[PDB]
Amino acid sequence: APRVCVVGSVNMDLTFVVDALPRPGETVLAASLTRTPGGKGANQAVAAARAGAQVQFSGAFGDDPAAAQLRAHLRANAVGLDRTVTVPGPSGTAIIVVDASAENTVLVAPGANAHLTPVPSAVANCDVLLTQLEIPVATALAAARAAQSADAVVMVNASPAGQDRSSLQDLAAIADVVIANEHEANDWPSPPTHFVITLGVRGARYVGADGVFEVPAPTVTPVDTAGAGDVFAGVLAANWPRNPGSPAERLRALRRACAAGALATLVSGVGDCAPAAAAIDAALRAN
Amino acid sequence: APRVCVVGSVNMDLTFVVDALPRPGETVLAASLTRTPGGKGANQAVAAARAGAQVQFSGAFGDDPAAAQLRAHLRANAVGLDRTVTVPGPSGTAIIVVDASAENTVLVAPGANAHLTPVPSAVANCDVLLTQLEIPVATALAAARAAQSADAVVMVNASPAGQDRSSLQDLAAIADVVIANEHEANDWPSPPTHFVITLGVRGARYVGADGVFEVPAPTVTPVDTAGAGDVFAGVLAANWPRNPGSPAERLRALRRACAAGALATLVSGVGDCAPAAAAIDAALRAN
């Protein structure tokens, strides 16, 4: 089974349903609050594990009750946690407010994610390192350097967008595979060996050492496209060939990631929408 | 020492500092996040206790880890808890967002607070009942009727606005004192004997049996306005005379509440910003 190390963020998502956002100086009561584990790194780790990889997650948890729910989520999804850190203070937290006109207003704090420090021994004997931009760039870069030493593929999800360009140059230079949507790709300083651009409904496109090509996604009727990007990245990591690989093996990985991303749109929420390897196979058979 | 009974809410607060408050549809990255005990009722009880009152709190805690921290916060501030209850499920959660101008918004998922039913001896042996509207209005109303039978002052912080109109009308019919900002005051059904309308930095406006006048606050450079209204209310409760009361005693309570509210804006944080009685005295001396 492929071995994947994910170095990245973990957050509790607090979803409040309200009539309207509170105005300055106002107190509003929510109809409901629902707490769900999330974060790019955690979601990608879960997707990788469900897709068949042996996964180790390195991330930082807070000292709050949220941290125990986040660890429980990962453990229940067969994600290894021996290389994680605990830091005093809140876990990463996202507040999602859904109002009467169905607008989603999102407020994010890094919390413990901002204090994630490298664990190079986590990459030891991994085939792929997968990281994203919701942890300190110095930590992502150090993980990528460790992966380089260990002959593991450096796979970066260039998300979220809007990061300082100069801050990403060293990481861009070291990345083997970069995964980005079209907007995110524009904020990435330089192209990697294998540049994977996700295209929502259209699947993905590739530009790199293997050529230039489109990778279609299966046609589906979406319920909720949230979380599909994290599923794509985790599945891509679970299927990307260990070095030096081949074009056939990378193409297979791409097809599987596109298919898994499509499947993920069929399920509400971000945390439980990752398909199993068997469902991915079936979705591809069905074409 | 005046005996203040607070019947109201207790929440764990997640306080986020931003440059600008998020607008609908927006995603915003917070500068900082703290997790601290609060809730309008808890905050008002703490402020009344720091201002020199002997305080009892009646409120509903959840049966969760948060509740231990919330209870300890109240005990640490000399607020009595023998009339509190534990209700199944989560303690309340509030989101406080504070922008560059020190303005704030508050969003509350009341949790256990929404299930507070009238506790028999909640208002036993008090001089002033202070209540707010995150708990059921029918529970506030029951406390008010009990307090009034024992000739205690009925003092209502009419926040949040938009609660159960029929119960509100019954509560409004009997309230001695209502504390509200201008928007909240507009929503309140009918005028109390003493309508105290808070005006942020301009202090407060009074409308009622004593006529119509304004009471200024000390001029300050603000840090965080969140929590200051609860400080104003708790200090007002701690200084309000027994019924029918004299105009001079009421004016003195208003002056002290205005000063304490101003002082409360000098401190980051919501649940821990109430000044000591001596600080209130000192700020009034300095004018």
Ligand SMILES: Nc1ncnc2c1ncn2[C@@H]1O[C@H](COP(=O)(O)OP(=O)(O)O)[C@@H](O)[C@H]1O
């Ligand atoms: N409507 C859709 N139909 C089929 N596949 C989709 C659809 N939306 C997303 N996907 C899949 O998910 C991947 C990433 O999609 P994206 O829309 O970026 O996800 P997110 O909503 O999480 O940003 C795509 O490459 C694609 O495989």
Ligand SMILES: OC[C@H]1O[C@H](O)[C@H](O)[C@@H]1O
């Ligand atoms: O007035 C501020 C308070 O309102 C909400 O009840 C929050 O818990 C916060 O502590």
Ligand SMILES: [Mg+2]
């Ligand atoms: Mg989904």
Ligand SMILES: [Mg+2]
């Ligand atoms: Mg304050």
